[PDB]
Design an enzyme around this catalytic site. Structure first.
Site, PDB file in Angstrom:
ATOM      1  CB  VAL A 190       1.577  -0.362   4.227  1.00  0.00           C
ATOM      2  CG1 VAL A 190       1.406  -1.408   5.301  1.00  0.00           C
ATOM      3  CG2 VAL A 190       0.887   0.919   4.636  1.00  0.00           C
ATOM      4  CE  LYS A 195      -0.248   5.002   7.810  1.00  0.00           C
ATOM      5  NZ  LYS A 195      -1.642   5.129   7.281  1.00  0.00           N
ATOM      6  N   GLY A 252       0.833  -1.198   0.000  1.00  0.00           N
ATOM      7  CA  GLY A 252       0.000   0.000   0.000  1.00  0.00           C
ATOM      8  C   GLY A 252       0.866   1.245   0.000  1.00  0.00           C
ATOM      9  CG  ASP A 305     -10.691   9.371   3.920  1.00  0.00           C
ATOM     10  OD1 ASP A 305     -11.508   9.541   2.980  1.00  0.00           O
ATOM     11  OD2 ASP A 305      -9.462   9.326   3.701  1.00  0.00           O
TER      12      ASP A 305
HETATM   13  C1  LIG Z   1      -5.734   2.000   3.739  1.00  0.00           C
HETATM   14  C2  LIG Z   1      -4.962   2.838   2.765  1.00  0.00           C
HETATM   15  C3  LIG Z   1      -3.562   2.604   2.409  1.00  0.00           C
HETATM   16  C4  LIG Z   1      -2.829   1.478   3.029  1.00  0.00           C
HETATM   17  O1  LIG Z   1      -2.412   0.631   2.252  1.00  0.00           O
HETATM   18  N1  LIG Z   1      -2.777   1.418   4.368  1.00  0.00           N
HETATM   19  C5  LIG Z   1      -2.646   0.248   5.078  1.00  0.00           C
HETATM   20  C6  LIG Z   1      -2.658   0.291   6.490  1.00  0.00           C
HETATM   21  C7  LIG Z   1      -2.481  -0.867   7.252  1.00  0.00           C
HETATM   22  C8  LIG Z   1      -2.310  -2.078   6.587  1.00  0.00           C
HETATM   23  N2  LIG Z   1      -2.150  -3.349   6.950  1.00  0.00           N
HETATM   24  N3  LIG Z   1      -2.007  -4.251   5.898  1.00  0.00           N
HETATM   25  C9  LIG Z   1      -2.133  -3.480   4.797  1.00  0.00           C
HETATM   26  C10 LIG Z   1      -2.315  -2.147   5.234  1.00  0.00           C
HETATM   27  C11 LIG Z   1      -2.479  -1.007   4.475  1.00  0.00           C
HETATM   28  C12 LIG Z   1      -2.888   3.482   1.440  1.00  0.00           C
HETATM   29  C13 LIG Z   1      -1.748   4.214   2.097  1.00  0.00           C
HETATM   30  C14 LIG Z   1      -0.629   3.502   2.483  1.00  0.00           C
HETATM   31  C15 LIG Z   1       0.445   4.160   3.069  1.00  0.00           C
HETATM   32  C16 LIG Z   1       0.440   5.533   3.275  1.00  0.00           C
HETATM   33  F1  LIG Z   1       1.519   6.121   3.846  1.00  0.00           F
HETATM   34  C17 LIG Z   1      -0.670   6.258   2.899  1.00  0.00           C
HETATM   35  C18 LIG Z   1      -0.668   7.758   3.094  1.00  0.00           C
HETATM   36  O2  LIG Z   1       0.400   8.344   3.090  1.00  0.00           O
HETATM   37  N4  LIG Z   1      -1.789   8.458   3.223  1.00  0.00           N
HETATM   38  C19 LIG Z   1      -1.787   9.898   3.403  1.00  0.00           C
HETATM   39  C20 LIG Z   1      -1.925  10.118   4.887  1.00  0.00           C
HETATM   40  C21 LIG Z   1      -1.259   9.293   5.808  1.00  0.00           C
HETATM   41  C22 LIG Z   1      -1.428   9.512   7.170  1.00  0.00           C
HETATM   42  C23 LIG Z   1      -2.255  10.560   7.580  1.00  0.00           C
HETATM   43  C24 LIG Z   1      -2.903  11.363   6.630  1.00  0.00           C
HETATM   44  N5  LIG Z   1      -2.729  11.128   5.316  1.00  0.00           N
HETATM   45  C25 LIG Z   1      -1.750   5.595   2.311  1.00  0.00           C
HETATM   46  N6  LIG Z   1      -3.812   4.434   0.833  1.00  0.00           N
HETATM   47  C26 LIG Z   1      -5.058   4.567   1.244  1.00  0.00           C
HETATM   48  O3  LIG Z   1      -5.776   5.416   0.713  1.00  0.00           O
HETATM   49  N7  LIG Z   1      -5.612   3.833   2.191  1.00  0.00           N
END
Ligand SMILES: CC1=C(C(=O)Nc2ccc3[nH]ncc3c2)[C@H](c2ccc(F)c(C(=O)NCc3ccccn3)c2)NC(=O)N1
Lengths: 339, 621, 60
Positions: free
Chosen positions: B176, B191, B169, B288
């Site tokens: 992540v 993350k 992700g 969100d």
């Molecule tokens: C749920 C999600 C993302 C993601 O993959 N997160 C995630 C969290 C925990 C997890 N466990 N296993 C997969 C997994 C995946 C992915 C994502 C992954 C890493 C990131 F750093 C970000 C990201 O940078 N989002 C902008 C942000 C971050 C923090 C606060 C405010 N804004 C987004 N994009 C998204 O829109 N939603």
């Protein structure tokens, strides 16, 4: 007012006492001893250093065998030493780290010590099972134990920062007699040879003579300008000496009821922690917070000697009953044996 | 490369560290997974007086978990016959009449709800609380607790503690990755947000927020939220250790699958509702909500993720337009206008609509204009396709009400309102909670910016560990084996000591305040570290090497001050001494550092106080 | 305590005991101390250094 009357009457009596003493002051010890010979160089040297305490040493006592001694330390142990060999016969971990006095029972069977725990703890040396246990915890003082001396293996006298001294029956643990009268921490005591009297020196700057069997004070000696830290009977039971923070030792006579001599010098500015007599009484030995033990000529008042091998305060000393030796104990963790 | 428990001596310090914090209560220890584990091992096996209690506790806890009424009838009989009836027949049943009668009565009306024996639970706790707890403390099982707490309280995580694997992700500030925490073997997501990328886009508050928010929702093991176990950082990176979800997110699967039937949607909505519920019970609005913030696991069950834009409403209710255009409620979109829970319930509708139809309800004719979707969310109500069954129809209009007072979930009882929608008539919510429903979709196997101290001050308090997450991680992995190994290692050190004569324990029969390993410099010219065993007494600090008794010390009089200091970039204690001298100590763990600082300070103060009142002991001028 | 009537009486009685003892002349006390010292100066190892032979702390 009854209270005001008793107060003036005490003054009158202090005055009556002062004048009775002055009526006795027909001559001085120093006049009287004026034509005996000095003692010469009293040249003593360290024969033994007793190394083992891990911190300040506060007190020591010779066994009557003129051989073993006990010492008490900031490290929370009594060490019983054989000064002939420097071998630790016993090392006794105490229950309280805050020990500050100790005593060898005449019999050699028991030692005692205590301190800021306010208790006089009697350890037994010769158990039938070959082990060193606390046989009694003599409790009753409401202040630190500052000194303690056995009369025999079932009675002991203690002095305290609660301003009293006391007599104890060991078998029962009871405080059989209480010696009150001092108005400052009692720091030191010394049994007479007959053991039917003892003297005590206190932070009130006064020394008191007590009768053991009757529990009262017979006489009160003043003249030091500060705390009496140490006290010792002259060997014939008729005088004693004290050592004080005022930097003087003093000899007081019982039967004349007053000071005979001061042992001091413009140079010696530090307090005395400890005093003892040589066997004959001729020499008065005094430990000093400047790291030395001065040897004084008791009859003449002259500095006759110095024991100088401690890097911190000489906090305690003692002479053997056989008169062969002097132990000094120091804030530097060592005891030294001299002659 | 795996957990090592400190020796049992560690008890001297930890017991005191904990005591100062009030943590040594049955309440605070029993409610910790490892504490409970240890306390029960003690009761059952090392005290035949409390065995029956805990044994009784555990039968009830098992009863609570039984899924069916058929089964609760059977188990209540047994529990009654074994821990109540028999105990009564032998006048040895230390419980209220109320307790006995409450159960008794219920049984003959064959009335067997999951909370049947709760009355006993509180009283079993009463009976373990007192002398039993007290003995447990004296036991080596509480020593074992101290060993395990000390590890807990000394966790300092680095990237190096994880085995990092493939990227799963990505978004604005980072990535992540799935990972293994080396220690225990436990799989997680990591993350990583880049502090540079952050500073650039001025979302330092947003990364801070995601941590604080995670820290609010991560207790209680919510199988529908992607919760946190740890957070740490490096000079470059924020790291959250999160639940690993290998199945990717809904938005991807939406576009792979096409739209979802109502029944498929129902599965997703249910699980999501439970997660919303969990967060709402913790006064958090996610804000969100949408396919892409719903992840799937290997089996198809889902969870809400990424609390960045989530927000506490425990005190200040938020007002700002924050979410994703398409899913944001009116009260959201309206600034100054405040809002709580409500917005998630609306996003839920929007998102649910979106799984049915491929687009947010308020995104018409492929439109990519935000101000349009704002407009028709605020302005127009919801034209819902002919095909929407009435129950679905009810639910979506219930959720997508523009007036908050008229919106399903927002009318006072929270998620329960929604659970009761006829759209979910067919669900047993315990089965949803249990993840017992078969999922619809099974994921198929897949610039030159600078960093000032003023930046890294904002992350000063990012690091934490969630205690409960760590204990559970440990509980289910290495706890048993490590206890065996460590038990075994202890039994040998005691074997070596009956033979080599180190029997008597120096620290007993005296007034030792505390003891334990520390390390000092023993070479003055060289400055290496020597591990020694220390013993603090009220007037001195002694230490010894191994084998021999203590042959050096400091006195509480010698010590003028005790202060923290950095040495080899390690926090150490610096003791200033009498001569203008100095003495440096390194402790093996933070709690040991904290406790030696406090006790040394305490002991040197008291000793100086005391000595000054004592003419024979004090200094004379 | 200093305002105590019993304590003040105790002090007076004590000073009465202390005042009413038999005292001897300092000349006599001092002579008796001198005589003591001379009578036992023989028995006193710190007074004449004594030979290694008789002394357990030298040469052994
Ligand atoms: C749920 C999600 C993302 C993601 O993959 N997160 C995630 C969290 C925990 C997890 N466990 N296993 C997969 C997994 C995946 C992915 C994502 C992954 C890493 C990131 F750093 C970000 C990201 O940078 N989002 C902008 C942000 C971050 C923090 C606060 C405010 N804004 C987004 N994009 C998204 O829109 N939603």
């Amino acid at each position: 007012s009854e209270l005001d009357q008793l107060r003036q009457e005490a003054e009158q009596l202090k005055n009556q006492i002062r004048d009775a003493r002055k009526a006795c002051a027909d001559a001085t010890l120093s006049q009287i001893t004026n034509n005996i010979d000095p003692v010469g160089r009293i040249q003593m040297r360290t024969r033994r250093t007793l190394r083992g305490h891990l911190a300040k040493i506060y007190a020591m006592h010779w066994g009557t065998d003129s051989r073993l001694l006990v010492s008490a330390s900031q490290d929370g142990k009594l060490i019983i030493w054989d000064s002939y060999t420097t071998n630790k016969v016993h090392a006794i971990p105490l229950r309280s780290s805050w020990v500050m006095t100790c005593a060898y029972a005449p019999s050699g069977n028991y030692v005692a010590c205590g301190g800021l725990d306010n208790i006089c703890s009697i350890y037994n040396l010769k158990t039938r099972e070959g082990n060193v246990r606390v046989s009694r915890e003599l409790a009753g003082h409401t202040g630190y134990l500052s000194c303690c001396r056995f009369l025999d293996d079932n009675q002991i006298v203690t002095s305290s920062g609660d301003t009293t001294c006391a007599l104890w029956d060991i078998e029962t643990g009871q405080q059989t007699t209480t010696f009150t009268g001092h108005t400052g921490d009692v720091m030191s005591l010394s049994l007479a040879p007959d053991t039917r009297l003892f003297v005590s020196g206190a932070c009130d700057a006064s020394a008191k003579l007590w009768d053991v069997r009757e529990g009262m004070c017979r006489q009160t000696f003043t003249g030091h300008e500060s705390d009496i830290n140490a006290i010792c009977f002259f060997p014939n039971g008729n005088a004693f000496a004290t050592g004080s923070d005022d930097a003087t030792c003093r000899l007081f006579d019982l039967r004349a009821d007053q000071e005979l001599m001061t042992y001091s010098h413009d140079n010696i500015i530090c307090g005395i922690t400890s005093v003892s007599f040589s066997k004959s009484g001729r020499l008065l030995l005094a430990g000093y917070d400047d790291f030395n033990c001065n040897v004084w000529d008791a009859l003449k008042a002259d500095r006759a000697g110095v024991l100088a091998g401690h890097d911190n305060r000489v906090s305690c000393l003692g002479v053997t009953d056989d008169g062969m030796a002097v132990a000094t104990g120091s804030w530097d963790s060592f005891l030294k044996i001299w002659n | 490369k795996k957990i090592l428990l400190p020796e049992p001596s560690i008890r001297s310090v930890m017991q005191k560290y904990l005591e100062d914090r009030g943590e040594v209560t049955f309440e605070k220890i029993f409610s910790q997974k490892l504490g409970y584990l240890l306390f029960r091992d003690f009761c059952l096996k090392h005290l035949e007086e409390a065995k029956p209690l805990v044994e009784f506790y555990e039968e009830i806890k098992k009863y609570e978990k039984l899924e069916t009424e058929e089964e609760r009838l059977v188990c209540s009989r047994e529990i009654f016959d074994t821990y109540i009836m028999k105990e009564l027949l032998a006048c040895s049943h230390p419980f209220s009449k109320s307790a006995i009668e409450h159960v008794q009565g219920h049984l003959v009306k064959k009335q067997v709800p999951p909370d049947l024996f709760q009355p006993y639970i509180e009283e079993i706790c009463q009976n373990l609380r007192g002398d039993v707890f007290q003995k447990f403390i004296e036991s080596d099982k509480f020593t074992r607790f101290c060993q395990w707490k000390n590890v807990e309280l000394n966790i300092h995580l680095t990237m190096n503690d994880f085995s990092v694997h493939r990227i799963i992700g990505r978004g604005g500030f980072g990535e992540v990755y799935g990972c293994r925490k080396a220690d225990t073997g436990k799989m997680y997501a990591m993350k990583c947000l880049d502090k540079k990328r952050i500073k650039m886009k001025q979302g330092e508050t947003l990364a801070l927020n995601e941590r604080i928010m995670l820290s609010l929702v991560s207790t209680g093991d919510c199988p529908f939220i992607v919760c946190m176990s740890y957070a740490f950082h490096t000079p470059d990176k924020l790291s959250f250790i999160l639940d690993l979800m290998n199945g990717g997110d809904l938005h991807y699967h939406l576009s792979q699958h096409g739209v979802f039937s109502e029944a498929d949607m129902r599965f997703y909505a249910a699980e999501i509702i439970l997660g919303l519920e969990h967060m709402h019970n913790r006064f958090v609005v996610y804000r969100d909500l949408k396919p892409a913030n719903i992840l799937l696991d290997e089996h198809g069950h889902v969870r809400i993720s990424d609390l960045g834009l989530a927000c506490d409403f425990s005190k200040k209710k938020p007002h700002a337009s924050v979410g994703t255009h398409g899913y944001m409620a009116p009260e959201v979109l309206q600034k100054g206008v405040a809002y709580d829970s409500s917005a998630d319930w609306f996003s839920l509708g929007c998102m649910l609509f979106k799984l049915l139809r491929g687009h947010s309800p308020f995104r018409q004719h492929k439109t990519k204009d935000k101000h349009e979707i704002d407009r028709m969310t605020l302005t127009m109500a919801v034209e819902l396709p002919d095909s929407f069954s009435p129950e679905l129809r009810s639910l979506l209009e219930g959720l997508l009400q523009r007036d908050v007072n008229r919106r399903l979930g927002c009318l006072g009882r929270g998620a329960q309102e929604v659970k009761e929608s006829p759209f979910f008539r067919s669900l047993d919510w315990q089965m949803v909670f249990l993840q017992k429903y078969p999922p619809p979709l099974i994921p198929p196997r897949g610039k030159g910016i600078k960093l000032l101290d003023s930046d890294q001050e904002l992350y000063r308090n990012f690091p934490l560990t969630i205690s409960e997450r760590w204990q559970q991680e440990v509980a289910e992995t290495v706890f048993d084996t490590i206890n065996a190994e460590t038990d075994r290692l202890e039994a040998r050190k005691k074997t070596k000591n009956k033979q080599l004569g180190h029997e008597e324990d120096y620290a007993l029969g005296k007034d030792c305040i505390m003891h334990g390993y520390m390390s000092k410099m023993g070479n003055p010219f060289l400055t290496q570290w020597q591990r020694r065993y220390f013993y603090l007494f009220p007037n001195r600090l002694e230490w010894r090497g191994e084998g021999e008794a203590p042959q050096s010390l400091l006195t509480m009089e010698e010590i003028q001050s005790v202060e923290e200091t950095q040495i080899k970039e390690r926090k150490c204690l610096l003791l200033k001494i009498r001569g203008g001298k100095q003495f440096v100590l390194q402790c093996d763990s933070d709690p040991e550092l904290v406790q030696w600082k406090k006790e040394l300070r305490d002991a040197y103060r008291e000793a100086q106080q005391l000595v000054q009142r004592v003419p024979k002991m004090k200094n004379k001028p | 305590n200093t305002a105590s009537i019993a304590q003040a009486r105790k002090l007076v009685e004590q000073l009465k005991m202390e005042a009413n003892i038999d005292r001897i002349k300092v000349s006599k006390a001092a002579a008796d101390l001198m005589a003591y010292c001379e009578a036992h100066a023989k028995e006193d190892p710190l007074l004449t250094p004594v030979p290694a032979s008789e002394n357990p702390f030298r040469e052994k």
